[PDB]
């Protein structure tokens, strides 16, 4: 139910490997073992980035399918994710929560931060735990960026990457947004690479 | 010697196979010395849905030991002669009926004579010389059993063109279905 187009492109893969999204953490939850490709002699695991890709395409189809492009929420309290997410919001028009996720932002209609998503995307399912926990109280689907040691509780469609290094983060977010826009029609053809650099998504401090 | 090889019943196929038998020992010194003491009881012909048939050969049990030392060449020659027929060698094992609740006097009917043992022997002979590595009954959602036999990888080619034949033969002799499969 997807064309010979959507398959992983040599260029894409180059990007990924350049940003070491393939570098998985030292321990594997029994829940993410199928993602793990092989383990290196130093104890660092390798992720089937083909699967990283297909999960990206999936998360994209979902982010796409939501009627009002405002409802989708990107989240991150994680430093790097702040920067990346903000842009994600910009190009995709989704709503962003960088930094401190106020508790009860999904319950409690009285507070000013009250939002009623129809999909949450989260950078780190551990540091952003509460947003996941809270999404669970109100039928809100979570799509996360999980390392191989990230709690896969209350998440559907995990994207196996590398929550640690900023390159991996930014890259994944960017690829995500790009795929979404390719799905909407915003970036007409599929041969055309994104005019925008992934480095816009990277975390920079002066 | 077509009446010499059989045991008290001459039919067309049986006389033709006994005659082929003779003409096959007539062209050898060791094969003739081995095949001559080898008698066989009866023969049965049963069809496959490929357009051809199969020749099951009933053998007295205490002779099968010797029959197995020759069976590859013997079936080779008997298949080169009798063409469009898949030749199979089975033993003759008498099954005893299960003791009824009012069964009068019966000696403790041994397990070798049990319906189970016998059918699992028919399986065993059906695929000589390849060796059965494990069986597996499927219980369907329609209430049909399917016995799945698994075979080795040493003599695949000797039997590969015969699988379907078994599925007929067995079905004619046991009433049970069967499927064959080989370990990846």
């Amino acid at each position: 139910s997807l064309p010979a187009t959507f398959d992983l492109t040599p260029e894409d893969a180059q990007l990924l490997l350049a940003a070491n999204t393939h570098l998985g953490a030292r321990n594997v939850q029994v829940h993410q073992e199928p993602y793990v490709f092989n383990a290196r002699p130093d104890g660092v695991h390798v992720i089937n980035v083909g699967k990283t890709w297909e999960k990206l395409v999936l998360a994209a189809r979902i982010i796409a399918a939501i009627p009002n492009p405002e409802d989708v929420v990107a989240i991150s309290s994680r430093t790097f994710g702040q920067r990346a997410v903000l842009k994600f919001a910009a190009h995709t028009g989704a709503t962003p929560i960088a930094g401190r996720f106020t508790p009860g932002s999904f319950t409690n209609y009285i507070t000013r931060s009250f939002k009623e998503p129809r999909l949450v995307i989260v950078t780190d399912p551990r540091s952003d735990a509460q947003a996941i926990k809270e999404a669970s109280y109100v039928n809100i689907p979570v799509i996360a960026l999980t390392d191989l040691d990230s709690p896969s509780e209350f998440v559907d469609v995990a994207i196996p990457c590398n929550n640690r290094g900023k390159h991996s983060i930014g890259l994944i977010w960017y690829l995500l947004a790009r795929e979404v826009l390719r799905l909407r029609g915003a970036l007409v053809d599929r041969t055309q690479p994104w005019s925008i650099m992934p480095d816009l998504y990277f975390y920079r401090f002066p | 010697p077509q009446a010499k090889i059989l045991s008290q019943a001459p039919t067309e196929l049986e006389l033709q196979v006994a005659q082929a038998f003779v003409e096959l020992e007539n062209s050898s010194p060791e094969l003739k010395a081995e095949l001559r003491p080898l008698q066989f009881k009866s023969i049965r012909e049963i069809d496959v849905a490929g357009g051809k048939k199969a020749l099951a050969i009933f053998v007295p049990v205490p002779s099968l030991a010797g029959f197995h030392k020759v069976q590859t060449k013997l079936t080779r020659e008997l298949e080169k002669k009798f063409q469009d027929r898949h030749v199979i060698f089975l033993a003759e094992r008498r099954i005893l009926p299960k003791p009824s609740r009012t069964s009068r006097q019966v000696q403790k009917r041994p397990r070798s004579r049990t319906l189970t043992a016998v059918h699992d022997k028919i399986l065993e002979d059906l695929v000589f010389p390849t060796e059965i590595v494990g069986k597996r009954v499927r219980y369907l959602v329609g209430g049909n059993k399917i016995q799945k036999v698994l075979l080795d990888s040493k003599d695949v080619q000797q039997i590969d063109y015969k699988l379907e034949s078994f599925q007929a033969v067995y079905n004619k002799l046991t009433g049970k279905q069967i499927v064959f499969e080989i370990p990846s």
Partner: protein, 129 residues
């Protein structure tokens, strides 16, 4: 020790269904487990199951849908007169409409409604719903 096989079989199946798994690996197997499962299947409480030979006593792999609220074994296989069935079904099953207290009679193993129909009775194995 392993005193009833049927007991551990049905226990495994139940636990698995609660976890929401999709397959279980029963061991060992029995003519009885086989029959019990065939009856479970006839009413579609489980999908299809496979018996694995190993010369000892086989294992079984059962696939299950999710239609199984609880199956269990009633333990000392009490005898049951025909009129008595009504009381068992009045206790175990959640409803007069459905469910099955499955028996062992001299006319084979079967659910209780088949026992009603064939007009026989025997001992009581367990119960499905």
């Amino acid at each position: 020790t392993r005193s009833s096989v049927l007991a551990d079989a049905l226990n495994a199946i139940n636990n698995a269904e609660k976890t929401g798994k999709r397959q279980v690996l029963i061991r060992p197997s029995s003519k009885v487990i086989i029959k019990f499962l065939q009856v479970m299947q006839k009413h579609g409480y489980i999908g299809e199951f496979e018996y694995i030979d190993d010369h000892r006593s086989g294992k079984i792999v059962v696939q299950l849908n999710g239609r199984l609220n609880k199956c269990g074994v009633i333990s000392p296989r009490f005898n049951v007169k025909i009129g008595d069935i009504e009381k068992w079904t009045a206790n175990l099953l959640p409803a007069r409409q459905f469910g099955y207290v499955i028996l062992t009679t001299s006319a084979g193993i079967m659910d209780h409604e088949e026992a009603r129909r064939k007009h026989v009775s025997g001992k009581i194995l367990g119960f499905v719903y």
